[PDB]
Amino acid sequence: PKPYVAINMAELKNEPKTFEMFASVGPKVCMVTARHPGFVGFQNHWQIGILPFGNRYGGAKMDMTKESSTVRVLQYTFWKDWKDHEEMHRQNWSYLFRLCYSCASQMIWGPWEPIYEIIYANMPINTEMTDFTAVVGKKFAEGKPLDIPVISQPYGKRVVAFAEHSVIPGKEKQFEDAIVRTLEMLKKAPGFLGAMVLKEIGVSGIGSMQFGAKGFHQVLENPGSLEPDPNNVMYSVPEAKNTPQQYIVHVEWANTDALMFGMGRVLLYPELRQVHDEVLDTLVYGPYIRILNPMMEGTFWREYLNE
Amino acid sequence: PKPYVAINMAELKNEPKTFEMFASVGPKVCMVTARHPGFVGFQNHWQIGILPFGNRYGGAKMDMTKESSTVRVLQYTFWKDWKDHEEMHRQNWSYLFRLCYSCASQMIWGPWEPIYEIIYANMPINTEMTDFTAVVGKKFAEGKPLDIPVISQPYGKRVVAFAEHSVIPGKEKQFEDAIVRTLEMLKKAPGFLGAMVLKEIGVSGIGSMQFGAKGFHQVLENPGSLEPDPNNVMYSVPEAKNTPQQYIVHVEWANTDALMFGMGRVLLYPELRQVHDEVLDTLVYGPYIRILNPMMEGTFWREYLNE
Amino acid sequence: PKPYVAINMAELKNEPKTFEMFASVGPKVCMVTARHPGFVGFQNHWQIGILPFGNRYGGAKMDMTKESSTVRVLQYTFWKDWKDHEEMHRQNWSYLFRLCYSCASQMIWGPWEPIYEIIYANMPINTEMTDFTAVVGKKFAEGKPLDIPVISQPYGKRVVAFAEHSVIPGKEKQFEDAIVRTLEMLKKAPGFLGAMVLKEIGVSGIGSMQFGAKGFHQVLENPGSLEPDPNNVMYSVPEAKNTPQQYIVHVEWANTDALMFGMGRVLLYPELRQVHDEVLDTLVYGPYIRILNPMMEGTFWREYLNE
Amino acid sequence: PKPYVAINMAELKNEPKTFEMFASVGPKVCMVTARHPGFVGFQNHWQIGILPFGNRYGGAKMDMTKESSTVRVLQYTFWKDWKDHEEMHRQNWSYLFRLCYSCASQMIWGPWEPIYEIIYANMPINTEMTDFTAVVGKKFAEGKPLDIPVISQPYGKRVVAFAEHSVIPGKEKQFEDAIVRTLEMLKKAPGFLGAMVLKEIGVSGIGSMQFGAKGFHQVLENPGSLEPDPNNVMYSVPEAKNTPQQYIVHVEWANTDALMFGMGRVLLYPELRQVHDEVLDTLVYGPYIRILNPMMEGTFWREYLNE
Ligand SMILES: [Fe+3]
Ligand SMILES: [Fe+3]
Ligand SMILES: [Fe+3]
Ligand SMILES: [Fe+3]
């Protein structure tokens, strides 16, 4: 079935100490999150650059890692019910806060953790290049050659287009209908590895370290080993849902060239351009497209998705 | 059928002279071992690092070869009957001892050669990337597409997780049942190339250069061209079997990222975590996981295994 | 009386940060251990090298500290009853775990903490070179000149031969009789500072950070300030006792030359060689001899020993 | 059908000028050879090294190109009838001599051009990694999945073991029977790309620039633009056939590791070792194994071979 998605977002200093700290803290956080039976996996991203749209963002390029002073992380966790995410954080708060707070020394902005529902998904299981022979053999043995997927390689061996959209109130249905038609046509582009549309349903205050006064002071004063009061979150997840409605169009690609020209198919192929124009007519903001590297991931979230 | 496994273990200086000596002496030892008809192949490993488990072993990394002052070798030989290994050593002692003793100038610890029975094996034949087209065609022509394996590349083009376990006396059946259930579920991870469970049955004194007093002095005094008395081994293979019972869980992977996150599936995927927890409850020691490079190998041992 | 000995073993990166951490954390751990009235002292060792036995381990030398990428520690704590060690760990768990876990960032292997009984001891009190005049005067005034010991200098000013043995099941009495006869003759070598024979009685799971599943996850997920459940150790100390039976022959020497040629007396002096040959005939493994520097120590453990 | 093979052999200075002239002269010679309708293709090799057989040739390694002062070339041309090669040389002598003579400035030894019959061949068509999808589709459409070959990549993207043998007079039948059995078993080795056995039938005097006195002086005196008398070759091809009988066992491999351990299967796998021992018992010389890079080739010779 379709899981819910929590996306923990933050900006940190782009230096080895940041990546060293992620190598030790990151796995621990994932192991704590896996204590909850509603956890179905994760996909953690480093932003490597920004899609320039020709020279609309002429100061950007798809890989800015050599020049950038910061690194943005977008850490997806997948949940049977979005309430499982909230329960997990509270049930494991003493571990989670102390682990997550240990990254504060590198932090420039965040954490900010919106929660999303998946309204469309065309996402395959990941396979390494070593696996495809057995996948093909099994699918043919089952008489299901149409179920043979593209090779979507895990652990940093593909790239993600993370396309931010906000929609004019009252045009959500037009946006959703047109973006699904767009993605159904986009899958013909070479190197397309899958797409999904995420629709924001709210924000996790506890995952964003957004408390009332009491917890705010406890966060600011923390030596690192004392939990803020997890009951001092002042709003539920849906209370923080944004209007204009926010969406993420998440598209995976074999490499950054396939991403650039593949996403570009909505501008360059006349039939698709007419369809995608219906998306553009509904927007308050966007599309703004971040280029992401999916490095650490728990690939079994796609097994839950595809049943 | 399942062969027995002898694993010759040693630690040597990490310097070019060590790898030069292995390039010339190593093949000679393998050729002598192949004189016995019970020999069914071999798989020789260099340890490249240690799995850090987040930062549980924070001084370790999966590839420590650039910094390490030593190199550990784990040389598997496969036998129709473990007694064939003992007979081979004695029948060819003048060659084997003089070849193996020539390594002494580089040696820091070893040799130590435990013997194992295989209690579980899910291991494919090795294939190079050039081979899969013919393998696929042959299996389909035979009507056995389910027998098409993953591509497990020989000669250093994959990695091994070598997981050491010792088990509380009386919990061996619980360990064995649970680890098999774990490995049957682990094979869904991307880049999984196979697994087997080795259970120690004893130690080869002659393969470990472990003699009584007479042979000990002959080893220490040796100019290099005089054999110690091979009859001066004071214990049979089973007499040295350890209690607590020792196991090796040997899992092969496409690359070190697939290894790290694939092995991590027993921690990150809740359903598998519950199964693997039954393994953890039985342990005196472990899991301690060495990262191995299978460089020199006689791949036909898997043909014997898979018949 | 003879205390029991717990030996905490670990391997860490050989870099200044490791020795800095030991200079601050080490004393803290010792002070916590001293909270228990059954604690009678300690003797902490750095391995400086390996005895090469001519060129049997030709890649080794007695001092490998300049080249080695790792450092092995062997931390002896002495106890009136071995159960005191287990009680101390649990009574002081919140301090001990957090202190010991702070070493994890430097750790490659360990901790592993076997427990031993002393079956033979000929070990003097330590004295500095400044002390011997008062020791001599006191012993003569008491009419006990035979109780004047050799000068065994504390705090890194002597060396230890740490000789590992494992014994064929059924040959333990032969080993023990012969090694005692050997050590009674070895004390004639110049620079001999004492010897003792340690016989393994089990392993401390809590001291080895070896828990069931619950504690294992708590260790891996730990931010550093949360204790694993100390009741989640799944085995008692005796349940982990190894067969083949393990022994440590611990011999102290004025310097590494006295060690090399003094230990060599069991090979070079014919009458002693015949006696020590009876030891060699009983072995599954060994002798493998580590060269240790006893740097930080609580010398009063020898006062308890010698009453 | 099986073509005949002419192998032009020479040794030249290992310097850029040699490879420059080969980049210009080599294609011209091949274009001239293709003027004859009996020409069915070619496969030109650079020797990159020598198989050391452990340390039997301890001064050798499989890739000596960085240290070698010379480069050996082995240029295979394939012919419907070996007489076609002789006719081609004479019909096109003014071009061929002047082209081939232009390499003399770099030459140390050669040219020497023995002629061979193929007595056994298991050689696939070459395919690039881009081609295999269409090859698989075509073979399944023909209902012949057993005809799907391994991927044997052209133009320097595989390696050749060139194994020289000379056979005791009267043992030719034993050699030929046993080598065919050996190669039929060797094809199980990973990365095996094909094998063929070439049996010398004679030597091309004209291709070897081996004339009588008249042509010898014309070669030595040549300014580069005057042909020696092509009728001054004093021996026919069969008149130069060697006794002891010479063979080449030509085996192709995915890479040099697959070659080393794959060819080693005749020494390391007991069942194959027994078969290959029947080859060894017949030899005057060899096996001596050159490691070759097949760079420039006309791959259609395998289309002729395979019908
Ligand atoms: Fe969260
Ligand atoms: Fe052996
Ligand atoms: Fe302890
Ligand atoms: Fe020719």
UniProtKB/Swiss-Prot annotation, chains A, B, C, D:
MF terms per GO, please? Answer: metal ion binding; sulfur oxygenase/reductase activity
Q: How is the cofactor bound?
A: Binds 1 Fe cation per subunit.
- EC class, as a word, reads oxidoreductase
* Coiled-coil region(s): none
Q: Outcome of altering C100S? A: 1% residual enzyme activity, and no iron bound
Where it sits in the cell: the answer is: Cytoplasm
Q: Write down the InterPro entries for this protein, in alphabetical order.
A: Dimeric_a/b-barrel, S_Oase_red
- Effect annotated for changing H85A: No enzyme activity and no iron bound
GO CC annotations, alphabetized: cytoplasm
What EC number is given for this enzyme?
1.13.11.55
Principal localization reads cytoplasm
Q: Give the record's keywords alphabetically.
A: Cytoplasm, Iron, Metal-binding, Oxidoreductase
Ways its activity is controlled = Inhibited by zinc.
* Origin superkingdom: Archaea
Q: Result of mutating C30 to A/S?
A: No enzyme activity. Still binds iron
Post-translational modification Cysteine persulfide, affected residues = C30
Q: What induces it?
A: Aerobically induced.
Q: Does the keyword Oxidoreductase apply?
A: yes
The chemistry this enzyme catalyses reads: 4 sulfur + O2 + 4 H2O = 2 hydrogen sulfide + 2 sulfite + 6 H(+)
Which coenzymes or cofactors are required? Fe cation
Q: What is the effect of changing E113D?
A: 1% residual enzyme activity and 4% of wild-type levels of iron bound
Identify the residues that bind Fe cation.
H85, H89, E113
Chain's role:
Catalyzes the simultaneous oxidation and reduction of elemental sulfur in the presence of oxygen, with sulfite and hydrogen sulfide as products.
State how it assembles.
Homoicosatetramer. The resulting structure is a hollow sphere where catalysis takes place in the inside cavity.
- Listed name of the protein: Sulfur oxygenase/reductase
